[PDB]
Amino acid sequence: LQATPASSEKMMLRLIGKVKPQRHMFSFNNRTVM
Amino acid sequence: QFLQWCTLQPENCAVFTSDNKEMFQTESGLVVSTYSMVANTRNRSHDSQKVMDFLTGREWGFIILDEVHVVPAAMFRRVVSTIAAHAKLGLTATLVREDDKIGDLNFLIGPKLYEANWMELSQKGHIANVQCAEVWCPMTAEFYQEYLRETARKRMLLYIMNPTKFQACQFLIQYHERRGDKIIVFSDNVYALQEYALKMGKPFIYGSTPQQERMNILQNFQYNDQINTIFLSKVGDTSIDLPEATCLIQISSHYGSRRQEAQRLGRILRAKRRNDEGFNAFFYSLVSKDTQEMYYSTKRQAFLVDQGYAFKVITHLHGMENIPNLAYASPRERRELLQEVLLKNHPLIRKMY
Amino acid sequence: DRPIDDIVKNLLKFVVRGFYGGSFVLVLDAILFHSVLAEDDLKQLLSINKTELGPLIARLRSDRLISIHKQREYPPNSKSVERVYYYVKYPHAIDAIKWKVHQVVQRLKDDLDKNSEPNGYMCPICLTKYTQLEAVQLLNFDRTEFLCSLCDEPLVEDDSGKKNKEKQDKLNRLMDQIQPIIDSLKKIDDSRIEENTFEIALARLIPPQNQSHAAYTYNPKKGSTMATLHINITTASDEVAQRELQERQAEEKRKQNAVPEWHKQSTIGKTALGREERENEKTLNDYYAALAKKQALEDEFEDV
Amino acid sequence: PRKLQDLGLKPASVDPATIKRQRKGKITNTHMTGILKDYSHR
Numbered sequence: 150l151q152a153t154p155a156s157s158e159k160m161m162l163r164l165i166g167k168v169k170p171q172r173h174m175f176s177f178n179n180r181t182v183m
Numbered sequence: 184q185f186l187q188w189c190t191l192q193p194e195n196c197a198v199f200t201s202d203n204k205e206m207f208q209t210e211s212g213l214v215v216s217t218y219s220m221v222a223n224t225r226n227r228s229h230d231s232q233k234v235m236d237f238l239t240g241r242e243w244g245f246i247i248l249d250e251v252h253v254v255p256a257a258m259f260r261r262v263v264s265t266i267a268a269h270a271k272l273g274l275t276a277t278l279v280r281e282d283d284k285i286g287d288l289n290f291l292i293g294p295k296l297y298e299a300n301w302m303e304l305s306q307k308g309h310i311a312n313v314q315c316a317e318v319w320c321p322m323t324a325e326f327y328q329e330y331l332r333e334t335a336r337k338r339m340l341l342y343i344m345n346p347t348k349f350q351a352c353q354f355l356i357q358y359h360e361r362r363g364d365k366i367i368v369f370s371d372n373v374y375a376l377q378e379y380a381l382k383m384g385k386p387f388i389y390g391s392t393p394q395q396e397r398m399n400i401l402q403n404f405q406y407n408d409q410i411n412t413i414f415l416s417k418v419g420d421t422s423i424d425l426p427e428a429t430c431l432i433q434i435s436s437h438y439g440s441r442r443q444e445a446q447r448l449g450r451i452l453r454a455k456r457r458n459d460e461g462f463n464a465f466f467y468s469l470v471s472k473d474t475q476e477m478y479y480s481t482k483r484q485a486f487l488v489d490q491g492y493a494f495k496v497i498t499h500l501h502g503m504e505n506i507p508n509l510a511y512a513s514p515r516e517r518r519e520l521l522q523e524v525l526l527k528n529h530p531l532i533r534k535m536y
Numbered sequence: 537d538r539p540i541d542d543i544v545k546n547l548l549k550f551v552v553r554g555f556y557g558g559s560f561v562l563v564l565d566a567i568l569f570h571s572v573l574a575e576d577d578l579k580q581l582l583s584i585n586k587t588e589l590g591p592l593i594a595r596l597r598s599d600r601l602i603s604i605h606k607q608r609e610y611p612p613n614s615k616s617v618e619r620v621y622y623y624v625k626y627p628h629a630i631d632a633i634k635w636k637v638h639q640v641v642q643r644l645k646d647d648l649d650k651n652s653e654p655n656g657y658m659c660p661i662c663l664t665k666y667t668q669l670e671a672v673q674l675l676n677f678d679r680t681e682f683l684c685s686l687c688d689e690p691l692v693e694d695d696s697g698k699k700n701k702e703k704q705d706k707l708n709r710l711m712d713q714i715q716p717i718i719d720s721l722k723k724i725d726d727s728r729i730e731e732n733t734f735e736i737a738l739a740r741l742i743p744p745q746n747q748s749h750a751a752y753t754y755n756p757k758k759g760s761t762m763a764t765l766h767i768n769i770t771t772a773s774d775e776v777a778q779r780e781l782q783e784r785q786a787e788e789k790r791k792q793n794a795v796p797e798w799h800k801q802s803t804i805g806k807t808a809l810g811r812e813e814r815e816n817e818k819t820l821n822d823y824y825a826a827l828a829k830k831q832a833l834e835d836e837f838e839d840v
Numbered sequence: 841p842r843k844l845q846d847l848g849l850k851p852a853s854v855d856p857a858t859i860k861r862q863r864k865g866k867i868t869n870t871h872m873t874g875i876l877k878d879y880s881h882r
């Protein structure tokens with residue numbers, strides 16, 4: 150899993166799977182929910 | 184100290200320095216300063232003159248004289264005369280001086296109150312058990328021949344720059360870095376300090392160094408683990424803030440000064456590992472054999488052996504034969520070092536210029 | 537989620553269904569469902585006109601029911617039109633509702649007070665009011681009729697004052713219908729209301745459509761002054777291994793705290809420094825078997 | 841809010857925002873430049 154900090158303007162989550170690895174690429178609109 | 188270990192509100196406390204000159208509005212409080220301002224015979228500023236006049240005109244009941252060994256000096260002897268105080272307290276760690284004027288402290292402060300038993304404090308875990316050792320460094324023939332033909336001022340730099348002491352210091356650094364010991368290497372000669380920093384590759388601090396650089400080196404010593412050896416000049420001998428260390432290497436010193444030995448040894452007396460069982464602090468004094476280092480170090484260790492410490496001699500180090508890095512092993516490099524030491528000693532016209 | 541949030545949603549729904557028209561109910565329910573909404577979101581969800589939402593948004597802003605946020609963001613096409621976000625300020629909304637209902641009932645009480653006096657006298661030719669206090673000096677010497685100063689016309693009695701019971705019945709019919717409002721504010725005033733804003737309303741948003749032109753992420757500006765749990769399972773065999781590790785850090789700590797060889801020993805005596813049972817157990821098991829037979833877009837990342 | 845308490849009706853709102861609210865110097869260790877790390881905190 151890959152996350153963004155509070156200093157980032159665009160906040161974004163990355164999920165990398167295991168065996169080509171699958172990538173899921175998620176945008177949440179609130180900091181607390183994220 | 185006055186803010187944390189005692190219940191003193193900051194309005195009773197004032198600082199009389201160059202940067203800080205405010206003075207307390209209460210009828211009685213605390214002012215902390217250095218001997219240099221009050222005893223200054225030069226022309227002082229108007230604010231400092233007002234502070235000095237207030238100190239002279241206000242009757243003080245008690246004075247704390249930290250590091251009382253500088254009191255019997257030339258102008259500091261007057262700090263008990265310009266300031267009127269009933270009770271005078273002298274607190275220091277080095278009650279020794281080379282001149283007889285140290286024996287005049289009884290005329291300045293009073294009778295000697297209490298002498299601390301250093302073995303009693305060390306065996307109870309209050310201070311670290313320092314292992315006072317003296318590593319002997321023999322002379323090469325050409326260096327010692329050059330030592331016998333020159334004056335004493337060049338002789339000092341000549342016996343400091345012996346390659347045997349370089350090898351011994353490098354081996355001691357290599358040995359004590361593997362053990363996780365924090366190492367401070369003291370040497371008063373600034374050119375010696377620079378040569379050691381160039382040859383070994385460790386940070387060096389002297390008097391005219393930038394202060395931000397000094398703090399950066401200090402926190403790199405305290406926190407960063409790939410720097411465990413710091414080289415310092417006489418600045419670290421005085422009462423300045425230094426990080427905690429367990430190993431000290433004394434390369435050179437300002438002649439036979441007994442005060443400087445205890446001043447340097449008190450840096451490692453406040454080690455963090457004092458609560459650990461079997462911990463022994465390390466204090467090595469690198470000396471050049473058959474030279475005036477022997478005389479000066481024997482004079483210097485007199486106060487420490489009077490306190491009780493035993494300086495064990497070390498003439499052989501196991502690891503010189505199979506050392507990885509050999510400093511000045513080749514004879515030509517030793518000679519090159521030898522001649523290096525010998526060679527050491529109108530608003531419009533303004534644009535036209 | 538919060539029962540108090542459901543309660544204040546019921547407050548807003550009931551007041552807009554009672555004192556406002558159907559389109560106001562539609563926009564207020566749209567804002568209550570999806571917490572933060574822009575103008576294009578309303579125009580997509582409700583198929584509403586700008587001229588149709590004009591009076592609605594104006595009335596709901598004048599009554600402090602819908603809060604407007606004037607944030608503009610930076611889309612990838614950079615066409616930063618000044619989108620307005622419609623959300624709800626729950627303490628402001630409940631304060632506005634309470635103030636409005638209190639002012640309505642106080643104005644009705646004042647109307648009842650001004651209806652409590654006697655009727656008075658009207659002049660219909662000049663259409664002029666006359667109270668009982670000021671009609672005293674307009675009588676004739678005949679002592680028969682109230683004569684006006686201007687029209688010199690026989691005055692007639694007002695029908696006001698006799699409508700006192702009608703206004704009382706109006707108060708009765710208002711008060712029992714507003715009883716759910718009072719009962720709900722009894723629970724609201726006994727509870728704690730958090731002050732929400734656009735950032736707070738962003739935490740509970742519902743997406744209105746798939747592709748929203750307005751970005752809901754807040755863009756701050758400079759100069760605006762307006763953990764893990766891991767377990768170790770050992771099958772009663774590796775305890776000796778952990779004790780071997782423990783004694784190994786013990787012995788390396790004692791080695792690193794040991795005195796050096798030149799300290800514990802004098803170095804002056806040396807030179808100066810310078811430059812098979814498997815078949816057995818198988819036959820055993822065979823014997824026991826025989827015996828038993830016998831007896832039986834990319835950004836920067838951190839790993840979290 | 842400051843008159844709702846005067847009218848006896850207890851407000852359920854906090855007071856809104858309209859109510860008053862709150863060098864570089866020389867380096868001498870030039871032969872080891874870049875190996876020292878900055879430490880701005882303990």
Ligand SMILES: [Zn+2]
Binds near residue numbers: 684
């Ligand atoms: Zn009329």
